[PDB]
């Protein structure tokens, strides 16, 4: 290990040298100070994205004038909200379609990338699949097997959302997929304290399945049925996000947990709890917007299938956060706030220093005519960076 | 965006920091001062020849475990201080040792999804098909057919081609991610002649041809199943392939290594010695199998991992030799930089940072229980630094 400690010496006794015995810590904190102030201002020349028009304006824009790329982004958006839950595909037809279906989508992905099933953006597909959904954490070999079993007796991909899936339980998953190709993939639970178990209830309201080790029924993840499982027409699971289409709940089922949601509004006073019923409503009454594209040829609407994404996750950004000058136009405009900043020392000096210069880099080597950027990619750009 | 606001931060940060230094002219100095150092650690090891000595290498990094450095020294005593030694779970009590046919090169495999193993991040098949190409593979229609007579006859795949890219290449990984194809790519090792003798040898080794070579010329779409190469065991990382229990009969084995040893003895070049000699040893020397064996097979993969540690110590040991002393004998080579001759002041601050790293291992003295430090790790940690 003397090369290990080596290394690290190298690398500790290089900056003492180079920086004349400055203070890291210090100077890590002046690029903070600046890091802030710079985002702070983004926030300032950023121009907010609402109006139906305005959304087509920037959804033309990130599509290059594609117009029926913008026009088509701006009716889906139109039809869902402007954080409704829009997903791409493969149209067999010549035109653009857009079509409402039973679905949702909740902000947690993949537990291991080794689920990944297709390269292409590093996502796990499936279709008709079953889903598991455990109110306790899964950590060992004898609670996940059963229910592998019998997903692979029937040939079905399983979805699994638990709290957690880690330990052997997860070494099981892993090796599995990876040596034989069984079609599973695991995701964590969204939410905390009791709206994660709504939550979790929700989905198998949805998809008619039950939650084990609720506190409710108890149920054995060991004395796992078929019938247990919940039924997804299609997943979609990144390394964010999770997508849920055409679950295999019955529509009644899915109204009478509406209508709990519902009585639930009306006794509570705070304003946070409402937040998460109204959350959990939506995402029960409200479907997905599907937008199928469409050309000549398989491989054209390929390409354009790429296109559609890609302005559409800019146009999804810019509705977030705004849209500021691009170029890095933004960036520059942001230099003189740092004069403002009070540091302590000569090292904050040093690091507020550093973004100051490094900001007109990206402006260097390059709103009515295009030139946006959406803020939230110039300040996660900037963070990163950093 | 992100890459070049990343980029400008270290740029400017470093300039900021060192107060306006030279960066190129820094490496050269703190390369310089590695140079120097390398060439005393060179004549201050010690080799590692005797069994007495490897034995010892081995049990100190196993952690004093005796038995570990026995079944390391007696696997050298079969197969060379050189010879390929692999490590594999063991079905008894204790540790075996099996000298088996096959060979090992140092390529690769093409796409990391070809891994089926997370641990190690290894591609793993038994009684597998072989394709060996001279030229490159590019069209899904030149090995569709290969890959049939792979999938009737139930047998794993894998490719050594000069490359396999284009849309060959993405539906392999787009077969082996979504429905579980057995199936890896790896480069052929090698260049120009040299690279097509070891394919050759391959072939003779495996009882397979090699398609798109210069003598036959055959074409990929013609292959029959008596083409293909047969393999008892692949075992495939990132970096190396190994291939074991070729299906190629005694009889052609002797006489294509009855070429190589006339050729040998047909040339003055220390270095087509060397080639030819590499080729022997993959035709006609034979692999150590290290099985692993244990009361549980949470002990097994215990002991495993510390055989394969004991190992690669082992064999890094024997190329280069162990530094004597470890920590302490860097302080021997910081004289030798007093000499070093500058020629501007950022080039006098390279060799100050080499100068005060050297100084430490010894400054903090596992040490006192006993380790060991091969001049080969060391001198790639200096190398990496620079």
Do not use: W
Not at 174 to 190: E, H, I, S, T
Not at 356 to 369: C, S, W, Y
């Amino acid at each position: 290990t003397t090369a290990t400690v080596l290394a690290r010496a190298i690398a500790k006794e290089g900056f003492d040298t180079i920086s004349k015995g400055a203070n890291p810590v210090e100077i890590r904190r002046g690029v903070m100070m600046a890091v802030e102030t710079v985002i702070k201002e983004l926030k300032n020349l950023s121009k907010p994205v609402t109006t139906p028009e305005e959304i087509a304006q920037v959804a033309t824009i990130s599509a290059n004038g594609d117009v029926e790329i913008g026009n088509i982004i701006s009716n889906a958006m139109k039809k869902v909200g402007r954080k409704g839950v829009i997903t791409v595909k493969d149209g067999k037809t010549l035109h653009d379609e857009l079509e409402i279906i039973e679905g949702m989508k909740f902000d947690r992905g993949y537990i291991s990338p080794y689920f990944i099933n297709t390269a292409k953006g590093q996502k796990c597909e499936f279709q008709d699949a079953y889903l598991l959904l455990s109110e306790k954490k899964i950590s060992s070999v004898q609670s996940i097997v059963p229910a592998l079993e019998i997903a692979n007796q029937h040939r079905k991909p399983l979805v699994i959302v638990a709290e957690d899936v880690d330990g052997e339980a997860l070494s099981t998953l892993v090796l599995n997929r990876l040596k034989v190709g069984l079609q599973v993939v695991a995701v964590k639970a969204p939410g905390f304290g009791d709206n994660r178990k709504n939550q979790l209830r929700d989905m198998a309201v949805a998809t008619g399945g039950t939650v084990f080790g609720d506190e409710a029924v108890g149920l054995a993840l060991e004395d796992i049925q078929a019938h247990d499982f919940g039924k997804i027409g299609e997943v979609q699971i990144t390394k964010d996000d999770t997508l849920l289409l055409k679950g295999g709940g019955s529509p009644a089922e899915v109204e009478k947990r509406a209508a709990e949601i519902v009585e639930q509004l009306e006794n509570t006073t705070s304003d946070y709890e409402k937040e998460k019923l109204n959350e959990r409503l939506a995402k029960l009454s409200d479907g997905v917007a599907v937008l199928k594209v469409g050309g000549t040829s398989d491989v054209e609407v390929n390409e354009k299938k790429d296109r559609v994404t890609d302005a559409l996750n800019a146009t999804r950004a810019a509705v977030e956060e705004g849209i500021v000058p691009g170029g890095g136009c933004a960036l520059l405009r942001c230099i003189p706030s740092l004069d403002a900043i009070q540091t302590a020392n000569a090292d904050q000096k040093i690091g507020v220093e550093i973004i100051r210069r490094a900001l007109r880099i990206p402006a260097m080597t390059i709103v009515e005519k295009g030139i946006i950027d959406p803020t939230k990619v110039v300040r996660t750009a900037l963070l990163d960076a950093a």
